[PDB]
Amino acid sequence: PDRAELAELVRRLSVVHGRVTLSSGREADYYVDLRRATLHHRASALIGRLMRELTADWDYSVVGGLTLGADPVATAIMHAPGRPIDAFVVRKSAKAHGMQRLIEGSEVTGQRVLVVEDTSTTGNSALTAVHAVQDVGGEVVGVATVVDRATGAAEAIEAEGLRYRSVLGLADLGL
Amino acid sequence: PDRAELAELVRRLSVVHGRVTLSSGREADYYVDLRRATLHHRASALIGRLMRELTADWDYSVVGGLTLGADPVATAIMHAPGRPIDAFVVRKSRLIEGSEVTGQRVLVVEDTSTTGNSALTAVHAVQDVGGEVVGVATVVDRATGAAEAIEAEGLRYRSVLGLADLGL
């Protein structure tokens, strides 16, 4: 029921129907804004729960990713029922202070880390977080995401020796 | 107990004592890394509870502020028990992500700040889109005029913690 409850909320909240002229001059009939679910009271509590179950067999104390598409997901996982898991956010530029200048939040040095994102087209953003955690001495145990969009992300993440899992898929969006 | 236990988590996770050089060149005897608290599993859960208690007499359906500092606070409030409250995020540079703020009563959040400019930016961004801001709540007030700046704009300001809870 949860996967289906979430899947429906993602469709309703995040598939934004309506015609739009892009900067290129092409028109699209819809676009996919996952931030609308990841920041919704109900969809986020489901995301938290389901991403915990999805990764239950992985060994990690810390969850995080690349701002902003990761923050709400990571915090959802942190707040969801179960064993303690802390969070972190990889920035795009360097903090003024500390010994992990691209990483807000919890100390990832010497921890096993889950890397998350709401959705990835290329896996660029996820891998940017993976390497940022890596450069500071964190063990990335895998990457997980709310929605796979079958656009190359899995094979890009798998190419660097890392597991990839998703709660939802292209079919769950309708389209 | 909740407030006392958060205070202790904020001292232990976020108040970094020792001679330090700021980005300006100024030397301080400490700095505050409030995000280690806002991204910690226990402290964030207390933040959501306590920020909800703190603003229980205000009417708002949506909570959020300027990225990154606000997002961990906004989602802790959203995930905390009680009546449903959605979240939003004001970007620095399409300004508002997440839940709709237009036509809604909105709580602007900040983890902490010396000047309140970040809070103000979020307030202004919500106003430009037809949201009504009911006030600003923060985790830590630094007693450096943030409050009064927010009050000059006709907005109520509140904090869970203050300067004295940070043992300086």
Numbering used by the authors:
A (entry chain A): 4 to 178
B (entry chain B): 4 to 96, 104 to 178
Task: Give excerpts from the publication.
The fifth step in the de novo biosynthetic pathway is catalyzed by the enzyme orotate phosphoribosyltransfrase that synthesises orotidine 5′-monophosphate (OMP) and pyrophosphate from α-D-5-phosphoribosyl-1-pyrophosphate (PRPP) and orotate (OA). Herein, we report the X-ray crystal structures of MtOPRT (coded by the rv0382c gene) in complex with PRPP, inorganic phosphate and an exogenous Fe(III) dicitrate molecule (ferric dicitrate, FDC) at 2.25 Å, 1.90 Å and 2.40 Å resolution, respectively. In all the structures herein described, both monomers composing the functional homodimeric unit are related by a 2-fold axis, with a solvent excluded surface between monomers of 1045 Å2 (13% of each subunit surface).
The inspection of the catalytic sites of the protein crystallized in absence of ligands revealed a bulky residual density located in the substrate-binding pocket I of one monomer of each of the two functional dimers present in the asymmetric unit. All efforts to unambiguously assigned such residual electron density to any of the substrates or products of the catalytic reaction proved unsuccessful. Given the predominant nature of the mononuclear dicitrate species at physiological conditions and the presence of iron(III) and citrate species in the crystallisation solution of ligand-free MtOPRT, we manually fitted the FDC molecule in the electron density with satisfactory results both in terms of ligand geometry and refinement statistics. However, both approaches gave unsatisfactory results, poor fitting scores (CC < 0.7) and refinement statistics, prompting us to conclude that a mononuclear iron dicitrate is present in the MtOPRT active site. FDC is held in place by hydrogen bonds involving the non-conserved Ala99 (3.5 Å, long range H-bond). These interactions contribute to the stabilisation of the “flexible loop” of the neighbouring chain. Moreover, FDC O7(2) interacts with the amidic N- and O-atoms of Thr124 (3.1 Å and 3.2 Å, respectively), while the Oγ of the conserved Ser26 forms hydrogen bond with O1(2) of FDC (3.3 Å). Noteworthy, in our MtOPRT structure, the conserved Ser26 is shown to exclusively interact with the FDC molecule, and does not participate in either OA, OMP or PRPP binding in MtOPRT orthologs. Moreover, in order to further support the structural data, we performed thermal shift experiments that showed a stabilizing effect of FDC, not matched by either Fe(III) or citrate alone, with a KD of 1.6 mM, well below the concentration of Fe(III)-citrate present in the crystallization buffer.
